[PDB]
């Protein structure tokens, strides 16, 4: 099964967003081969923010 799809519009937009926001300041951990848990935490943060 597959939950995320990095080839869509909003996922690719967020991908480019974090790629641009990482060249200036180094992130704590690398972002190569991302897992579904990262996307789940992102969606949870967005849910909390919208609520």
């Amino acid at each position, epitope marked *: 099964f597959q939950l995320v799809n990095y080839t869509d519009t909003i996922p690719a937009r967020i991908m480019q967003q974090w*790629r641009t926001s*990482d*060249a200036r*300041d180094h992130t704590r951990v690398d972002w*190569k081969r991302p897992k579904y848990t990262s996307a789940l935490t992102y969606d949870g943060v967005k849910v909390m923010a919208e609520a």
Partner: single-chain antibody
Amino acid sequence: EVKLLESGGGLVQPGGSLKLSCAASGFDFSEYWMSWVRQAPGKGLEWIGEINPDSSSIDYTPSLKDKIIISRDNAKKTLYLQLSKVRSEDTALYYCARPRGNYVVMDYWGQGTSVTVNIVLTQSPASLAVSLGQRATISCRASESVDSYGSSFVHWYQQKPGQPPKLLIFLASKLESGVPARFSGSGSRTDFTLTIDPVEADDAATYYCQQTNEDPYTFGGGTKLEIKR
């Protein structure tokens, strides 16, 4: 390991436009960022062209926007450091670089070309000489904050005369590929310190400690390393 091969080395006439094309061998740069930073002769580097993996935000320099034209393609993996109406003071050593600002796996600069048209990154010692198989541990002090979430956001790239600057460490917690586990960089809120052991003849170059956590993200003061015998 990506290996960018630059093409178009040589001089140029005045009034035209110098288009420097650098082919990226190994794989494509669609998922990896790109950057074309020029380097002066004997001095540090200079961030002129800022790009992204998919080449979405091709940011220009704050004072060299009219002397550079970013135009590349992620699916082609072939950048083009073009310009328009270059001046006479643009005589430097242009060079490309693979993803280094957001990649610490296999970050390595490009080949480069030759053409003749706060933060105090002070490293110590700037010049030394060690015997064969010896050990050397140089330091690199800074004026701004050097502590960024424990892992010091700084690297150490050594450059030789005529060769491009090759990266050795990354974020003081992961060394570059190719070279073995012989360069250990560290530092705790005081100064970046990188120890190399054992010394070899290939390490006879001019090292430089660069930090990406403070402006500017260019090369440091330069530490010449001579392999004495």
